[PDB]
Structure formats: structure tokens, C-alpha cells
Amino acid sequence: RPESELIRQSWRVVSRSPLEHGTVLFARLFALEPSLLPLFQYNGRQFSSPEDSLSSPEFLDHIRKVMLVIDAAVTNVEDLSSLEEYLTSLGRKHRAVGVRLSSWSTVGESLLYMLEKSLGPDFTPATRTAWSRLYGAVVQAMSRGWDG
Numbered sequence: 001r002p003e004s005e006l007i008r009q010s011w012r013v014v015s016r017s018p019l020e021h022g023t024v025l026f027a028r029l030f031a032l033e034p035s036l037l038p039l040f041q042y043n044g045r046q047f048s049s050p051e052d053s054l055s056s057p058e059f060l061d062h063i064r065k066v067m068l069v070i071d072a073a074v075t076n077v078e079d080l081s082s083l084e085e086y087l088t089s090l091g092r093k094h095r096a097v098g099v100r101l102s103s104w105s106t107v108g109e110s111l112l113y114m115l116e117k118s119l120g121p122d123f124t125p126a127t128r129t130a131w132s133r134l135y136g137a138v139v140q141a142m143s144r145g146w147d148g
């Protein structure tokens, strides 16, 4: 595949400042779906507003965790199945936190938003398509975490 290098090359820019870029992702996420804000429970309390989350060291640590998992997916873009068991457990964890299957689509849109804003003219339709495919594979693995 050639869209693997598309992924690697587009990730390079954002991966140098992962907290700054992940902050865009989460600000976008809460703008689109405010009901995700209460899922964070640090110190047994709920954030009132999205800007409250940005003041929380624990919340910012989670942004770094998110960006590191995406980095693992990019690293293994030609061979994701290697992350399947890890992602299944990560999905199970998030289901327990309260994330629902539908919310992963909003996370996906927030990731694409953050890439679009960072890459500008370099966010080509092929780049969008490559990322949608990679993210979709990640969500498919995480969704194995759920049970029916």
C-alpha cells in the first residue's frame, strides 16, 4: 500500500507536539458531543465545562495516552493485527468508563478535524481516506471489547 506512507508522513508533523495537537482533538470532541465530558472522573469529580478539562493534569495525561496509542497504530500501519489484543482490552476498558460504540465515530471526526487543521492544503482526500481506514481498523479492534 502507498497510503501507509501517506499516514506516516502526515503523522510526522502532528507527532512532534502531541499535547498541543491532542488538545485540539479533545476540544473538538467536546464541542461535538458535550455528553462525553462527565466520563472523566478524576478525584471523584465531574468537569463542569470543557475548559475545566484542560486545567487537569490527569486529563492532559490522557491526551498523551491517546496520542501514544495512535502513534502505535501508525508504527504498525502495515500490520495492525499485532495490536488487536491490546486494542480489544482498551475497548473493554472504555466501555466500562462509559464510552458507547457511537461515540467512536465522533472521536474519529475529531481526529480527522485535528489532522485537517494541522495539515491544511496537505490534508488531501487520499490522506483523509487513509486515516479513515486506519482509524476504522482501530475502532473495529476496540469494539471486540464489547459483548452482546
Ligand code: HEM
Pocket: 036, 039, 040, 041, 058, 061, 062, 065, 066, 067, 069, 070, 090, 093, 094, 097, 099, 103, 107
Ligand atoms: C470518548 C472518548 C474517551 C473517553 C471518554 C476516555 C476516557 C478515559 C478514562 C476515564 C480513562 C481512565 C483514566 C485515565 O487513565 O486517564 C481512560 C484511559 C485510557 N484511555 Fe481513554 N477516553 C477516550 C478516548 C480514548 C482514545 C481514542 C484512546 C486511544 C486511541 C484512549 C486511550 C486510553 C488509554 C491508553 C487509557 C489508559 C488505559 C489503561 O488504564 O490501561 N482513550 N480513558
